[PDB]
Amino acid sequence: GFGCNGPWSEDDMKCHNHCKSIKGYKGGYCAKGGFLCKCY
Amino acid sequence: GFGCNGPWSEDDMKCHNHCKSIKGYKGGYCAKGGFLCKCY
Amino acid sequence: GFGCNGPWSEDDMKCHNHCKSIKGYKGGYCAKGGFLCKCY
Amino acid sequence: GFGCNGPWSEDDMKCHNHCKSIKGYKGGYCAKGGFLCKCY
Amino acid sequence: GFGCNGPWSEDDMKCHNHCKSIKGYKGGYCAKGGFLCKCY
Amino acid sequence: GFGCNGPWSEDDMKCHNHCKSIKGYKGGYCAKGGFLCKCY
Amino acid sequence: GFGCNGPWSEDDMKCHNHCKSIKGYKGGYCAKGGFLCKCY
Amino acid sequence: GFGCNGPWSEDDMKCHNHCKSIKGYKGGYCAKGGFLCKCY
Amino acid sequence: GFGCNGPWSEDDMKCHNHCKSIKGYKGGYCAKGGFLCKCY
Amino acid sequence: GFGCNGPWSEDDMKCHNHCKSIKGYKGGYCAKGGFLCKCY
Amino acid sequence: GFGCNGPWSEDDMKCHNHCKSIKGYKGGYCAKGGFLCKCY
Amino acid sequence: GFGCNGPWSEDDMKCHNHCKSIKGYKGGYCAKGGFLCKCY
Amino acid sequence: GFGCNGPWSEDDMKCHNHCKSIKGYKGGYCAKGGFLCKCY
Amino acid sequence: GFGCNGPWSEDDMKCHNHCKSIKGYKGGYCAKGGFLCKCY
Amino acid sequence: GFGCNGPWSEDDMKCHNHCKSIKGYKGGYCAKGGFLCKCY
Amino acid sequence: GFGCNGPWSEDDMKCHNHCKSIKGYKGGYCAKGGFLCKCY
Amino acid sequence: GFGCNGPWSEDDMKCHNHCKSIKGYKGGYCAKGGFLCKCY
Amino acid sequence: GFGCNGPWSEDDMKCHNHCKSIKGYKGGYCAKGGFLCKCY
Amino acid sequence: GFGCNGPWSEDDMKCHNHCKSIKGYKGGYCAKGGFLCKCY
Amino acid sequence: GFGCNGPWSEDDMKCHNHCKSIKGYKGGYCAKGGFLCKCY
Amino acid sequence: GFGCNGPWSEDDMKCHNHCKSIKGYKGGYCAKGGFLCKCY
Amino acid sequence: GFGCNGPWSEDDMKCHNHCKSIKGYKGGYCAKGGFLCKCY
Amino acid sequence: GFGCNGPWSEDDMKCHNHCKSIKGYKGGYCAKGGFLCKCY
Amino acid sequence: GFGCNGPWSEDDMKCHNHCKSIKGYKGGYCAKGGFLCKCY
Amino acid sequence: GFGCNGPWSEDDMKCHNHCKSIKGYKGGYCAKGGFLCKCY
Amino acid sequence: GFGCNGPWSEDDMKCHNHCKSIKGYKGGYCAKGGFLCKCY
Amino acid sequence: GFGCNGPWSEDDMKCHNHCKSIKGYKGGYCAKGGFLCKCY
Amino acid sequence: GFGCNGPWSEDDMKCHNHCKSIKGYKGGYCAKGGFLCKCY
Amino acid sequence: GFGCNGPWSEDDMKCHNHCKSIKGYKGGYCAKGGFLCKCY
Amino acid sequence: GFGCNGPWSEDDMKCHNHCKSIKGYKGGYCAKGGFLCKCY
Amino acid sequence: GFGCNGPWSEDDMKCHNHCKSIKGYKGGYCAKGGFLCKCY
Amino acid sequence: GFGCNGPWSEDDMKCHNHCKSIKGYKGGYCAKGGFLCKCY
Amino acid sequence: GFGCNGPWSEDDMKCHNHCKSIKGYKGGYCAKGGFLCKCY
Amino acid sequence: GFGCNGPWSEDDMKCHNHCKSIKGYKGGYCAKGGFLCKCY
Amino acid sequence: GFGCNGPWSEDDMKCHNHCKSIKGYKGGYCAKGGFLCKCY
Amino acid sequence: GFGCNGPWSEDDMKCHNHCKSIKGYKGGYCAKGGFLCKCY
Amino acid sequence: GFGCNGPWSEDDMKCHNHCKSIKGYKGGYCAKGGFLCKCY
Amino acid sequence: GFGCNGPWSEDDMKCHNHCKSIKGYKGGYCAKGGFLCKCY
Amino acid sequence: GFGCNGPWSEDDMKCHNHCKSIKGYKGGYCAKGGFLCKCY
Amino acid sequence: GFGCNGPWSEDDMKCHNHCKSIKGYKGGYCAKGGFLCKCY
Amino acid sequence: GFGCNGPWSEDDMKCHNHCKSIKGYKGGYCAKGGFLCKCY
Amino acid sequence: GFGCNGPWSEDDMKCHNHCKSIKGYKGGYCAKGGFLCKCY
């Protein structure tokens, strides 16, 4: 979710913005090979 | 299943919500390249 | 993000250019196995 | 970048050719475990 | 080919059978990051 | 092209046969994460 | 466009031919998970 | 195979269970950089 | 296994925690070049 | 763990900082050939 | 380059054959920890 | 080559067989720190 | 071989056990600077 | 740390420069078999 | 064996402790230039 | 042990200090050609 | 540094050349058991 | 240099051949405990 | 050379055979403190 | 040879046993200053 | 200690200087066959 | 058992699969004149 | 008996299980051409 | 008789029990292809 | 298997054809006394 | 035919008598494992 | 088929007659243990 | 004939007795692989 | 006879026991390729 | 194949005739102990 | 052929008689280790 | 006996184990061309 | 044993491996005319 | 012939008796390596 | 091995070809009386 | 005869004993290259 | 090779003819005691 | 006798040991060209 | 050839007669130690 | 013994080693015309 | 000829008797080193 | 040795070449009557 959809991912930075919106994280990326929004 | 349908999937969080509803899982994502709801 | 999408990355130097645009970095690469634009 | 994409890297010699195009370098290789084109 | 399709691969043994059809090989796996049937 | 269509790819050997039809190549596979027929 | 329509894409080589018709490109493929004709 | 699929590998212990099912092996791991289930 | 997946491994301490859960081991690490959870 | 991941290790000094945070140690390094954070 | 790709290296003798093709060298190997074809 | 791949090596006897295929040698090992098949 | 892999060698007594399996030897150690299982 | 990563060390004199930057030392080297920056 | 691994050996006293555990020996050390645990 | 590791010995005087810490000895040195801490 | 990296050291004569470049020295070698370029 | 690398030295006669190539010397050996090619 | 490598020597008879290949000598030993094959 | 290796010689009676195995000799000792097994 | 390390001693007069620094001695040498700094 | 039934046997691979489920065997055949699955 | 009924035999392992239930036998098979359960 | 009725034979052990009831026989089986109780 | 069934084997060349279908083999025969199809 | 029916063959000597009734043969037997009356 | 029905087959010569009716065959018999009419 | 029926032979010495009953022979056995009573 | 039945022979030692029961013989074996009990 | 079936082979000259039918061969025989038709 | 069938050869002197029946030969024997009737 | 059955022999070590069980014999083998267990 | 079975032997290396499992032997062959594994 | 069958010869003196029965000869032996009765 | 099987050896040049495949040998022959492939 | 059978000869001393049983002879041996018992 | 097979060699002149076919040789004979075709 | 069997002789020291067992002889050898154990 | 076969030579005077049949020679003998018919 | 076997001898150095195992001898040769190991 | 066969000569005085049977000679001996009956 | 085998010696210059390989010798010949390679 959050825009992590492998080759069909849209460039909206949705995962990054969603992870930033949570306190304690500075960003996010599509883990599980591009299909799981994970916050780092 | 649970909205994991590759490019036709909707950002409904249906997989995520369904996986959260089961005790012991923090969430879910669309494994098998976007076609299988899997709980993590 | 920034074009780091594993096997589906489009060879556009998007991560590298994005990292250069930030002062203090001379480039970037796709860390986390190709899925996280990281500036070095 | 420059074709350094871990397991999905192609054998195009793109990193090597790019590094040769810069004066003072004999070639290049994919450092950071195959994900960062580095000139030597 | 032979069922090596990255995240969309199935445990269909097509690569294994194809490799067994050649003298000297005991199996196959999906090289090139999951997209090329390779005999070992 | 040549049947490289990601999850909707049919194991038709079209990429493989097309690449073998060019002298100097042993075969082909679906690079770019399953969407580009590439000869090796 | 140019025949890049995901699962409903035909094998007409339309994207490849269109990309060849532009000087400076060797061919094309359906990026964005099979829905955007992109020249390389 | 057997759940060894690089970044798209799941944490299902599928390779480990498959290798334990062969009497005499302790377990298995994903060799060849995460793409070949190998028993030990 | 247990999160040991080379470059795609997550800093989940999953191997370490799993190895601690077995009596007699202080921890674990990803041997075989990052792909085999081994308890020490 | 703690950033000790062989060639894919990130330069965040995570192992060193983690070992310093434990009373009795002045630092740490990646033993086992770069894959086990060990405090000295 | 030339098939030196760490854990994802294929035993294709590409580095060896390439190095033998240059007069004065008996062969080659993957230096830099498996990521740089070097002739000896 | 011949299965000498540092931490990612497997006990596949490729180096041993390659060395046995030459008169006078009784085996082989991975020299250059585990990256070069050397006959002894 | 047989677990003699320099810094990446595990403490599994693999070389020792292999050498003891050859009737008449007391044990083995990693000669050639840790890279050759040698029986004594 | 500080660029001491065994075979994957990037030839940047990072350990040496880091050790020189500390008063009382004239250099440094990768001890512990190449994995620990140590100042002398 | 028993932690005798040349430059990569850890000050674990593993050889010493193992040799003490056998009746008649006061301790052990890494003979063969640091690669063979020998009890004295 | 105790820092007696031939050419890889560190200059920490570990053997000397260890031997001094035992009642009845005034020092120690690396006997057995630099590989056995012996108290005198 | 200067190519002194134990078993992974290349035969580039880098330490020797570097030591010659300093007035008053005839050459250099890898002291500290192969890990410290030292001029003589 | 010239193959004098302590325990990781290969019996390649490189030191010997190099020293014989200089007029006035019968051969060479690895002095400094195996780490410096010296002509005699 | 010829297997004379100080503490890392093996009873490989290389020095003995090399010396037997010269008229008048009945064997060889490792002179220069174990680092030079010398015929007697 | 035969355990005559100067300071690195072990107390294993290897030279003595080797010399006794030659029918007619009483024993052996390490001549040439500890580096040549000589029977008497 | 103090630079008495047999064949691996670095020609630094370290033992001699250390012994001179103690009142009542005019120098020192490496006794015990080169492995014990002894003041005379 | 396992499909070994003399003249009434079928090429059902039951014996082969049963034998493959045991470490070390590469197949099976119907011994005892076609009535006993035997692993080879 | 025990399911040994020639062509009408069912692969029920009844003969095998019955024979294993008797101490001293590894298994059983249908002797007499498929009509007599015999323990081996 | 005695339950030997080919495919319609029941698993009543009737033939075996009947044959045991006669002194001098260890058991019985359905000979004549499953239709004649015969004592052995 | 593959038509190797002792006296009940048919003259259908089934083993031979099966072995020829494996590219690189000339044919096959019924080893193990007529009960194991073996390729040559 | 002619009474050659494997385990269901009746003892009427039908094959033998039939073969004797043909001029040039002295008898017959059930070849093909008991299913083909063949005259000898 | 053609009267090959195991124990229920009738001595009708139906398989034999049918096989004779096809040019090139001398006769037929009930292979597969009496259940398949096969022409020879 | 005479009880020579391969695996379905009933252990009745029928062939042997039949052959003894003919003058000039001392016994018989099942030749042709168990399917032809032959007198010797 | 006496259990000599080629591949269908059981391990009952029947031929050996029968041959021992005749005075003047030490045992027996299945001659004629496994089909004739012969005393020696 | 071609009637070579060990003890169950028929004197059909099938191997001999088949081998004669191929130009350059005088005949054939049953090699591999009677189980492989080989042309000479 | 002609009765030359290794251990299953019948004593009918078939090879000898067959060879005598050909003009120019006085007999025959089973060459190729008992499997080829050869006329002398 | 003891598993010596020519081509139908199973590598069960039965002859070897039986012969070792008799004092004075190192082992056994299948003499008489594979049909008689003989102790040596 | 160990695959030494006269004319029915296969090049299975069982004798070779068995002999290699004993100190001092470099191989094995089938002595006693092809029926006894003998180490040399 | 006459009992000369290599390893399968039955110790019956058949060749010797046959040769004695011919006037002018005092015996016979199995020439041609055990496969041809020859009178001397 | 390698086609050296005494009288059952075939004229296939298998030993010769095997020995030539080992670079440096001219050919091979069947030593040990025809049962051991030996290279020269 | 008398146990003289070339490579298949047993060590029964049969030829020697037979030759001793004739007055005037001290023993016997297998002449004609191991195939003819001859008294001396 | 070429018919040189000791006692089992046939007077086929195969070695002689083969040696004549090579320019410069008058003929050949079976050296190595009858087992190696050698051209003179 | 005593292992003297020409080319098929096994280096079992049987002749030597047998001759030493007789008082007055130092040993034995295979006279008569390798076929008669003779004491010297 | 021509009956010159060392210890297996037959007394047929074949070499002598063959050499006499050639004009210019009065006889022949087995040179090369009994293995080459040579005319004198 | 010790490899002295006339024309069937191999250059195996068994005689040489046996003679070297006795004080005072420098080698051995095959006396008695090639059949007795003799030390010189 | 005439019993002159080097080490394999049978002590029959055959050469001597043959030479005496020719008028003008009083005996014969095995010239050419034991391989040619020559009359004197 | 080295091709000195009396009458069975070949003209291969093996003794001569072996003696020339020992630096300082001109050649060799077969002393001891043709059975000992002696260098001069």
Numbering used by the authors:
A (entry chain 5), B (entry chain 7), C (entry chain 4), D (entry chain S), E (entry chain 3), F (entry chain 6), ...: 1 to 40
Paper lines:
Plectasin contains a cysteine-stabilised α-helix-β-sheet structure, which remains intact upon fibril formation. We have determined the structure, kinetics, and functionality associated with the pH-responsive self-assembly of the enhanced plectasin variant PPI42 into helical protein fibrils.
We were able to determine the structure of the plectasin fibril at an overall resolution of 1.97 Å (local resolution varies between 1.9 and 3.0 Å) using cryo-EM, which is one of the highest resolutions hitherto achieved for a protein fibril in cryo-EM and allowed an unambiguous structure determination. The structure consists of two coiling protofilaments, which form a right-handed superstructure (mature fibril). The repeating or asymmetric unit (au) for each protofilament is composed of seven monomers. They are arranged in a near-helical way by forming a pseudo-right-handed helix with an average axial rise of 3.75 ± 0.15 Å and an average twist of 156.48 ± 2.25° between two consecutive monomers. The PPI42 protofilament is stabilized by a hydrophobic core in the centre (red spheres) and hydrophobic interfaces between the monomers (black spheres). The assembly of the two protofilaments into the superstructure is favoured by the interaction of the loop between α-helix and β-sheet of monomer 1 and 3 in each asymmetric unit with the two symmetric monomers in the other protofilament. The interface between the two protofilaments was calculated to be 722 Å2 per asymmetric unit, which corresponds to a small interface area for protein complexes.
